[PDB]
Amino acid sequence: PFELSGKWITSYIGSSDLEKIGENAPFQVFMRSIEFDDKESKVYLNFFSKENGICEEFSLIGTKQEGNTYDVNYAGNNKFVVSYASETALIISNINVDEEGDKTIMTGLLGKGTDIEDQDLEKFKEVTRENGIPEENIVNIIERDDCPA
Ligand SMILES: C=C[C@H](C)CCCC(C)(C)O
Known part of the structure; x- marks a missing residue:
């Protein structure tokens, strides 16, 4: 039985637009936790990002939408889905439309700390x-x- 809520840390991110995931970009996201609240149809995300090369922390609240997708506002509008879940990882697929209207597809592999399982990495x-x-x-x-942790 699978518990999707809890501590989740980012190990790798892919992006169709390299401008969104470099140094200090909005999508170079260091996840810390994700909490799914199916009763209230919401998801809670906590993570760090860098602006000015200094860590900044964010706590967002997304809304559950059709087909296990979630909508959340962050550097534009986002629609994401947990595409894969194992006991050691999540793979999230996200589509962002930024303030300029440009669309970027991205994937992220998340885990419980730093020691990556190759089977999760191959699926990512x-x-x-x-x-x-x-x-x-x-x-x-x-x-x-x-x-910071
Ligand atoms: C590329 C996937 C990362 C790990 C998730 C982005 C944060 C979001 C999409 C939930 O706002």
């Missing part, structure tokens, strides 16, 4: 590839997350 690369995102548009987030 396959979901990334299926979304049309090339291997070279994959960033290693564990290597870059020096934000």
Whole structure:
């Protein structure tokens, strides 16, 4: 039986638009926790990001929508789905439309800490590839997350 809510940390992110996931970009996200509240049809996300190279923390609340998708406002509007869940990981697929109207598809592999299971990593690369995102548009987030626990 699977518990999707709890501590989740980002290990890798893929993006169709490299401008959204570099240094200090809005989608270089260091996750800390995700809490799904099916009773109230909401999801709670807590994570760090860097602006000015300094860690900043965010706590967002998204709304459950049709088909296990969630909508959340962050650097524009986002529609994401937990595409895969194992006992050690989540893979999230997100579509962002930014303030300028530009659409970016992204994938993220999340885990319970820093020691990545290769089976989860292979499924992340396959979901990334299926979304049309090339291997070279994959960033290693564990290597870059020096934000507080
Ligand atoms: C590329 C996927 C990351 C891990 C999730 C982005 C945060 C969001 C989409 C929930 O606002």
